[PDB]
Structures are given as structure tokens and as C-alpha cells.
């Protein structure tokens, strides 16, 4: 808000914004048949925490 209180009580309502920061990691599986596998479980551990969180 700019409540510019000079000579004028000017009331502005300037919106601003912020986008959060999220990361997205992808993993892929292929074999010797050259066909992408479905049903494979892949587990991401965050190993920058000093354990397998």
C-alpha cells in the first residue's frame, strides 16, 4: 500500500507477488529391448541431509 501522506492522503493498493521455489527430479529406466519400463519403483532419498531421508 502507498499511503502517500503528503498534501494528499493518496491511498494506493499495489499488489505484489512471489512464486515459491520447488525442485522436481525425474528418473528414467530403459533396458536392452529399447522400450521404457512401467511398474518400476524408483526411491529418491534426499542424501544431502546426512542420512537417507
Amino acid at each position: 500500500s502507498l499511503s502517500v501522506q503528503g498534501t494528499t492522503s493518496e491511498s494506493a493498493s499495489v499488489n505484489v507477488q512471489y512464486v515459491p521455489l520447488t525442485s522436481t527430479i525425474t528418473a528414467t529406466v530403459v533396458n536392452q529391448e529399447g522400450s521404457p519400463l512401467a511398474g518400476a519403483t524408483v526411491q529418491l532419498y534426499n542424501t544431502t541431509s546426512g542420512s537417507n531421508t
Partner: protein, 53 residues
Amino acid sequence: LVATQTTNSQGVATFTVLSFPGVTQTFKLVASLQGYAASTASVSITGQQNASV
């Protein structure tokens, strides 16, 4: 068995076979060769595609 090839020096073993739209046309490619290990891979073309492994 509809086609057997003696492998060529251009390093594509190309064989022509009938195909049809909308069918998982599986093909087993067995390599039997004197001087190294005989091996069996397999592919599937679904409709028309180059299946190379």
C-alpha cells in the same frame, strides 16, 4: 522363421517382413557367431517402427 541373414559390413542387419497396423509384432533376434558369445535379444515393433538393439 521368415528371414535369416548373414550379417553385413555396414552394421545393419536388415530383414523385410510383413507388418499390419495395431499389433505388438514381437521378434526374437538370435545372434550365433563363431569367435564370440552367442546371445539372444528381442524387440517389439507396434505398428511400423525401427526396432534396433
